Structure 1
């Protein structure tokens, strides 16, 4: 398992053409102030590694959810 922070590189990973499945996981975290912000993990299943991109902003998370290719088996939750 590997973590990725570059959004463009994560998109290339979703387009790598050996990646057939992904999963979008939603967390209910607190960023050290007590209010329950919503974290999103995008995990694309590569052949040898599972790549996880963590976005703490639900807006960018929704943008990436839209930006995922429509051949990916997105697997919400």
Structure 2
């Protein structure tokens, strides 16, 4: 599994022709000194590698979720 950091790079990758499905994982965490925050992991399963994008902001995650191609099957965990 390889990690992707740039969100723009991630959406173009999600429309690669070999991408079967995707996983959206929600992790409840805490900003150390701060308080609870909700991390979301977007995982795209390609032919060779699984690509993970970590989005610590719960709102840009929701926008990203509506920015993925509608054809991909998405499993919510």
TM interval, short-chain normalised:
over 0.9
Unmatched tracts of structure 2, length 5 or more: none
- TM-score after normalising by structure 1: 0.95
* 4+ residue segments displaced more than 3 Å: none
1:73 Cα deviation after fit: 0.6
Unmatched tracts of structure 1, length 5 or more: none
- Spell out, residue by residue over 1:23-44, the C-alpha distance to the aligned partner (whole angstroms, 9 max, x if none): 0000001121251100000000
| Residues 20 and 71, structure 1, Cα contact 8 Å, conserved in 2 | no
In 1, Cα distance between the equivalents of 2:76 and 2:49? 19
Question: Residue 26 of structure 1 corresponds to which residue in structure 2?
Answer: 26
Residue 5 of structure 2 is aligned to residue 8 of structure 1:
no
- Secondary structure at the aligned position of 1:63 is classed as helix
